[PDB]
Design a protein around this motif. Structure first.
Motif, PDB file in Angstrom:
ATOM      1  N   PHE A  21      -2.434   8.231   9.913  1.00  0.00           N
ATOM      2  CA  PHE A  21      -1.200   7.812   9.219  1.00  0.00           C
ATOM      3  C   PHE A  21      -0.498   6.813  10.155  1.00  0.00           C
ATOM      4  CE2 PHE A  21       3.403   7.905   9.539  1.00  0.00           C
ATOM      5  CZ  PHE A  21       3.813   7.526   8.236  1.00  0.00           C
ATOM      6  N   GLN A  22      -0.331   7.052  11.429  1.00  0.00           N
ATOM      7  CA  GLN A  22       0.262   6.147  12.416  1.00  0.00           C
ATOM      8  C   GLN A  22      -0.559   4.891  12.651  1.00  0.00           C
ATOM      9  OE1 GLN A  22       3.744   7.263  13.417  1.00  0.00           O
ATOM     10  NE2 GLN A  22       3.215   8.784  14.970  1.00  0.00           N
ATOM     11  N   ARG A  23      -1.869   4.989  12.862  1.00  0.00           N
ATOM     12  CA  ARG A  23      -2.743   3.825  13.051  1.00  0.00           C
ATOM     13  C   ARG A  23      -2.678   2.877  11.882  1.00  0.00           C
ATOM     14  NH1 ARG A  23      -7.586   2.476  11.819  1.00  0.00           N
ATOM     15  NH2 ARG A  23      -9.003   3.984  10.775  1.00  0.00           N
ATOM     16  N   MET A  24      -2.795   3.332  10.665  1.00  0.00           N
ATOM     17  CA  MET A  24      -2.811   2.599   9.409  1.00  0.00           C
ATOM     18  C   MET A  24      -1.543   1.817   9.139  1.00  0.00           C
ATOM     19  SD  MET A  24      -5.605   2.521   7.645  1.00  0.00           S
ATOM     20  CE  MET A  24      -6.843   3.414   6.685  1.00  0.00           C
ATOM     21  N   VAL A  41      -5.455   7.568  -0.022  1.00  0.00           N
ATOM     22  CA  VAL A  41      -5.187   9.037  -0.161  1.00  0.00           C
ATOM     23  C   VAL A  41      -5.876   9.976   0.806  1.00  0.00           C
ATOM     24  CG1 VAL A  41      -5.544  10.868  -1.863  1.00  0.00           C
ATOM     25  CG2 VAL A  41      -4.712   8.590  -2.578  1.00  0.00           C
ATOM     26  N   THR A  42      -5.189  10.962   1.386  1.00  0.00           N
ATOM     27  CA  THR A  42      -5.861  11.904   2.286  1.00  0.00           C
ATOM     28  C   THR A  42      -5.983  13.162   1.416  1.00  0.00           C
ATOM     29  OG1 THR A  42      -5.113  11.017   4.374  1.00  0.00           O
ATOM     30  CG2 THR A  42      -6.075  13.363   4.400  1.00  0.00           C
ATOM     31  N   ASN A  67       0.826  -1.217   0.000  1.00  0.00           N
ATOM     32  CA  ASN A  67       0.000   0.000   0.000  1.00  0.00           C
ATOM     33  C   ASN A  67       0.851   1.254   0.000  1.00  0.00           C
ATOM     34  OD1 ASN A  67      -2.416  -1.926   1.422  1.00  0.00           O
ATOM     35  ND2 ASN A  67      -0.456  -2.020   2.455  1.00  0.00           N
ATOM     36  N   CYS A  68       0.271   2.346  -0.492  1.00  0.00           N
ATOM     37  CA  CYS A  68       0.894   3.658  -0.519  1.00  0.00           C
ATOM     38  C   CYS A  68      -0.086   4.468   0.342  1.00  0.00           C
ATOM     39  CB  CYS A  68       1.045   4.432  -1.835  1.00  0.00           C
ATOM     40  SG  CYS A  68       1.918   3.444  -3.062  1.00  0.00           S
ATOM     41  N   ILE A  69       0.525   5.370   1.084  1.00  0.00           N
ATOM     42  CA  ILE A  69      -0.288   6.276   1.947  1.00  0.00           C
ATOM     43  C   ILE A  69       0.304   7.672   1.648  1.00  0.00           C
ATOM     44  CG2 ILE A  69       0.864   5.186   3.999  1.00  0.00           C
ATOM     45  CD1 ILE A  69      -1.943   6.288   5.475  1.00  0.00           C
ATOM     46  N   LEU A  71       5.793  19.684   5.044  1.00  0.00           N
ATOM     47  CA  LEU A  71       4.427  19.492   4.461  1.00  0.00           C
ATOM     48  C   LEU A  71       3.902  20.901   4.057  1.00  0.00           C
ATOM     49  CD1 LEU A  71       2.250  17.896   7.234  1.00  0.00           C
ATOM     50  CD2 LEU A  71       3.434  16.523   5.480  1.00  0.00           C
ATOM     51  N   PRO A  72       3.176  20.991   2.961  1.00  0.00           N
ATOM     52  CA  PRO A  72       2.653  22.310   2.538  1.00  0.00           C
ATOM     53  C   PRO A  72       1.660  22.984   3.476  1.00  0.00           C
ATOM     54  CG  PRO A  72       2.712  20.780   0.730  1.00  0.00           C
ATOM     55  CD  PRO A  72       2.815  19.952   2.035  1.00  0.00           C
ATOM     56  N   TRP A  73       1.126  22.287   4.458  1.00  0.00           N
ATOM     57  CA  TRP A  73       0.084  22.820   5.365  1.00  0.00           C
ATOM     58  C   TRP A  73       0.457  22.645   6.816  1.00  0.00           C
ATOM     59  CZ3 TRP A  73      -0.352  19.148   1.465  1.00  0.00           C
ATOM     60  CH2 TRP A  73      -0.088  17.844   1.880  1.00  0.00           C
ATOM     61  N   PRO A  74      -0.237  23.305   7.710  1.00  0.00           N
ATOM     62  CA  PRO A  74       0.034  23.182   9.151  1.00  0.00           C
ATOM     63  C   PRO A  74      -0.183  21.752   9.593  1.00  0.00           C
ATOM     64  CG  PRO A  74      -1.127  25.181   8.615  1.00  0.00           C
ATOM     65  CD  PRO A  74      -1.334  24.238   7.423  1.00  0.00           C
ATOM     66  N   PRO A  75       0.454  21.399  10.695  1.00  0.00           N
ATOM     67  CA  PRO A  75       0.369  20.020  11.220  1.00  0.00           C
ATOM     68  C   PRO A  75      -1.074  19.735  11.468  1.00  0.00           C
ATOM     69  CG  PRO A  75       2.199  21.226  12.221  1.00  0.00           C
ATOM     70  CD  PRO A  75       1.339  22.256  11.508  1.00  0.00           C
ATOM     71  N   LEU A  76      -1.487  18.494  11.217  1.00  0.00           N
ATOM     72  CA  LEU A  76      -2.848  18.035  11.420  1.00  0.00           C
ATOM     73  C   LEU A  76      -2.806  16.700  12.183  1.00  0.00           C
ATOM     74  CD1 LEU A  76      -4.440  18.287   7.852  1.00  0.00           C
ATOM     75  CD2 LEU A  76      -4.390  20.202   9.479  1.00  0.00           C
ATOM     76  N   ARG A  77      -2.883  16.916  13.483  1.00  0.00           N
ATOM     77  CA  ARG A  77      -2.876  15.930  14.565  1.00  0.00           C
ATOM     78  C   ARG A  77      -3.669  14.674  14.342  1.00  0.00           C
ATOM     79  NH1 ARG A  77      -0.335  21.344  17.361  1.00  0.00           N
ATOM     80  NH2 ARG A  77      -0.119  21.255  15.043  1.00  0.00           N
ATOM     81  N   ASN A  78      -4.800  14.758  13.709  1.00  0.00           N
ATOM     82  CA  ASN A  78      -5.749  13.684  13.354  1.00  0.00           C
ATOM     83  C   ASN A  78      -5.358  13.017  12.032  1.00  0.00           C
ATOM     84  OD1 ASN A  78      -7.376  13.735  15.620  1.00  0.00           O
ATOM     85  ND2 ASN A  78      -8.863  15.176  14.743  1.00  0.00           N
ATOM     86  N   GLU A  79      -4.634  13.790  11.241  1.00  0.00           N
ATOM     87  CA  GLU A  79      -4.126  13.263   9.949  1.00  0.00           C
ATOM     88  C   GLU A  79      -2.957  12.353  10.335  1.00  0.00           C
ATOM     89  OE1 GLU A  79      -3.360  11.828   6.514  1.00  0.00           O
ATOM     90  OE2 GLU A  79      -1.821  13.084   7.368  1.00  0.00           O
TER      91      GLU A  79
END
Ligand SMILES: COc1cc(N(C)C[C@H]2CCC3=C(C2)C(N)=N[C@H](N)N3)cc(OC)c1OC
Length: 186
Positions: A34-37, A135-136, A5-7, A22-30
């Motif tokens: 990513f960690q759970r998966m 994909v997110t 898989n690719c994430i 990353l192009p955007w601010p940190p996203l704690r839930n993102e």
């Protein structure tokens, strides 16, 4: 070795990174997602292997390297040895996988996850066989310098749903995003 898989997290302009950031601010839930998966093995006694390029590897805060609970494999053709903190080094994905097919990691790896970069994403997408795109989608444009290669919908189908992935729009920091799964086999 189970599944390949690719994430990825991509902005609306298809941006995956800006100056190794990353192009955007940190996203704690993102991040949690990513960690759970990547960490969750579909089989007891086994571990997931996460494959990444040298750039990606160095783009993660050290505090967080190696990704714990998983085997870290960096892909490089210029490094002669694995970066400090990493477990294995390969010249290619063809080689990293054969490594898996070794009695080394033979009996230890479940699913294999590619976490970046483009180049790495591009050799996975060429890898004939079963492949899943996790994909997110960040719903805004963001100044980027590196991109996710375009997805060929004629080969990758967008799944209507996936167990353990939320189907509706998420929001964190005024920023909207959704989760998608694409599946190929050719
Ligand atoms: C800046 O902080 C961090 C950055 C990173 N990066 C950049 C790698 C990540 C994080 C998120 C993500 C990855 C790659 C991806 N391929 N797919 C999804 N969808 N999203 C990883 C970190 O901790 C592990 C971290 O700690 C906060």
């Amino acid at each position: 070795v189970g599944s390949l898989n690719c994430i990825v997290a991509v902005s609306q302009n298809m941006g995956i990174g800006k100056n190794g950031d990353l192009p955007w601010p940190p996203l704690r839930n993102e991040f949690r997602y990513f960690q759970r998966m990547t960490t969750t093995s579909s089989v007891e006694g086994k571990q997931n292997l996460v494959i990444m390029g040298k750039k990606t590897w160095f783009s993660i805060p050290e505090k967080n390297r190696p990704l714990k609970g998983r085997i870290n494999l960096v892909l490089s053709r210029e490094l002669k040895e694995p970066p400090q903190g990493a477990h294995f080094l390969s010249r290619s994905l063809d080689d990293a996988l054969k490594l898996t097919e070794q009695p080394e990691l033979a009996n230890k790896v479940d699913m294999v996850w590619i976490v970046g970069g483009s180049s790495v994403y591009k050799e996975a997408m060429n890898h004939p066989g079963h492949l899943k795109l996790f994909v997110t989608r960040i719903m805004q444009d963001f100044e980027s310098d590196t991109f996710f290669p375009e997805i060929d919908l004629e080969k990758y189908k967008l799944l209507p749903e996936y167990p353990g992935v939320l189907s509706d729009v998420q929001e964190e920091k005024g920023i909207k995003y959704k989760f998608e799964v694409y599946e190929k086999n050719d």
